Amino acid sequence: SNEHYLRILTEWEKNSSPGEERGIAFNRLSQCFQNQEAVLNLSDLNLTSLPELPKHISALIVENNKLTSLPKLPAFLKELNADNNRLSVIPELPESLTTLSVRSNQLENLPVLPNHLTSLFVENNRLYNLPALPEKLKFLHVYYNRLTTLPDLPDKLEILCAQRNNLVTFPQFSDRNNIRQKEYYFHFNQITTLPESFSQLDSSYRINISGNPLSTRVLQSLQRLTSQIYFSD
């Protein structure tokens, strides 16, 4: 099916806008299909759209472009890096996906997340709500968004960067997160009070809550209990 896919690439290449580089993309898309490679990288090519993607690829690197949408992702994609584009929606994700990077786009929603996802970077978007979080999630960046609440944190979450949002409450913490150090960032939000879940929270938890309109009351009590590592600037 070489001639088939080679046509699709040709029709896509001849539908270009003046500022794009669909010829360079055509070459990289050509070698990727014929050699059955695992990494397709079309970064820094001024592309406004992508053709149908070579199946059986593992990583798709299409960052620093002008993409407003993505085609149907390969059914066994391991990593997706679409950082710095103009996407408003992410297509349905393969259950094999473990790394999703879509920073600095214009996403207002996120699709359901696969269970094997360990890295989710969706900072600098327009999210108001975030879907349920995968159990195997380890690193999560959702800062520079417009969220107001967070879903329950998974049991293996190590780093959570949720600053620069509009959060009014803390998410529910896991009872079986027994890894060495949790680094949870919530600074520059709209959190007004501290939840009761902060008791019985080990020193394994490092939480930042600076830049939060914390009431002078809850600010006074924290000033006492501090005599979990917390920073209340």
């Binding site: 600098n124 600053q163 890894i179």
Partner: protein, 335 residues
């Protein structure tokens, strides 16, 4: 306050406002703020100062129990560093409306390095040498030795313009450390009260000892060579407690009548010399007022401005603060 320090404090505030992340204030010593490199600390009037070193953690690890090293000692150590540093990912710093990229929502991309969580968990049982390298043990104690456990760095060349007040500009090369985190390897008042502690320490000196101090400190204004030399000699005597010397009148003022070094007198001088570091062209105002006898006018002028804005996060405040300390101490010695 260079545009570089302006950029790095923005990074820290966006990534860890009010945390333990420390910004790099100068572009030339950024390469010594890498993971596994050692950093020295000292309490100052403005908090604590972070001093670069030439050491890594491998230089201070006691490896006498190991049998297989008796170039392998340098090969084994270097892999311990390269293997236990993870690039945990990239981050996005949005820049305020004053900052603009040369060449819209303005943003820069930075990269993170961290010592592995597994290696950090074994740091408790690794043994440190009894005698530290001389370049550090001569000026600072073992409990002020820290390990760089995390860094943030640029990923590409960044030319950033600033109009904070104009046309200030800095070009950060790729892979320049902008901020970092330290970890202790072993194991506070208000300004007016900390200056009163300083002035109280110096008031208990004899007349002659107070004039030796004033004569030495005045020679430091606008001459960074003499101030750096004085800070090094005062630090060394604070550690050694002895003296043989060109800076003999100042160092001898740190000892009391019985011949015992009063450590508070050495710390008070060091706080002065560190405050002088926060000043650049202002030191020429201090040297002028000291020359013409208008130090009181200069002190009231600084105080007046300090009361008018109570209505390097704020670099103007840091300057006024160091100015108030430097002028107050000199005025007190000249009484």
């Amino acid at each position: 306050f260079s545009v570089f320090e302006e950029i790095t404090r923005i990074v820290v505030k966006e990534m860890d406002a009010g945390g333990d992340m420390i910004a790099v204030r100068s572009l030339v010593d950024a390469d010594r703020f890498r993971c596994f490199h050692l950093v020295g600390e000292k309490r100052t009037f403005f908090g604590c100062r972070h001093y670069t070193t030439g050491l890594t953690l491998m230089d201070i690890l006691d490896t006498d129990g190991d049998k297989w090293l008796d170039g392998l000692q340098g090969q084994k150590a270097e892999f311990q560093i390269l293997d236990n540093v993870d690039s945990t990912g990239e981050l996005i710093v949005r820049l305020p409306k004053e900052i603009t990229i040369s060449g819209h929502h303005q943003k820069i991309k930075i990269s993170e390095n961290r010592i592995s969580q597994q290696y950090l968990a074994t740091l408790e049982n690794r043994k440190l040498k009894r005698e530290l390298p001389f370049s550090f043990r001569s000026i600072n104690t073992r409990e002020n030795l820290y390990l760089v456990t995390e860094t943030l760095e640029t990923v590409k060349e960044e030319t950033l313009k600033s109009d904070r007040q104009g046309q200030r500009e800095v070009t950060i090369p790729p892979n320049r450390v902008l901020s970092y985190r330290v970890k202790q390897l072993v194991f506070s008042r208000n300004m007016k009260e900390k200056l009163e502690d300083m002035e109280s320490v110096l008031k208990d000196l004899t007349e002659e000892k107070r004039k030796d101090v004033l004569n030495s400190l005045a020679k430091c204004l606008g001459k960074e060579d003499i101030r750096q030399d004085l800070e090094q000699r005062v630090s060394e005597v604070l550690i050694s407690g002895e003296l043989h010397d060109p800076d003999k009148p100042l160092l001898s003022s740190l000892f009391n009548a019985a011949g015992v070094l009063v450590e508070a007198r050495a710390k008070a001088i060091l706080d002065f010399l560190d405050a002088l570091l926060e000043l650049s062209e202002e030191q020429q105002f201090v040297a002028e007022a000291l020359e013409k006898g208008t130090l009181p006018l200069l002190k009231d002028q600084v105080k007046s401005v300090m009361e008018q804005n109570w209505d390097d996060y704020d670099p103007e405040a840091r300057i006024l603060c160091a100015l108030y300390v430097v002028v107050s101490i000199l005025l007190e010695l000249a009484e």
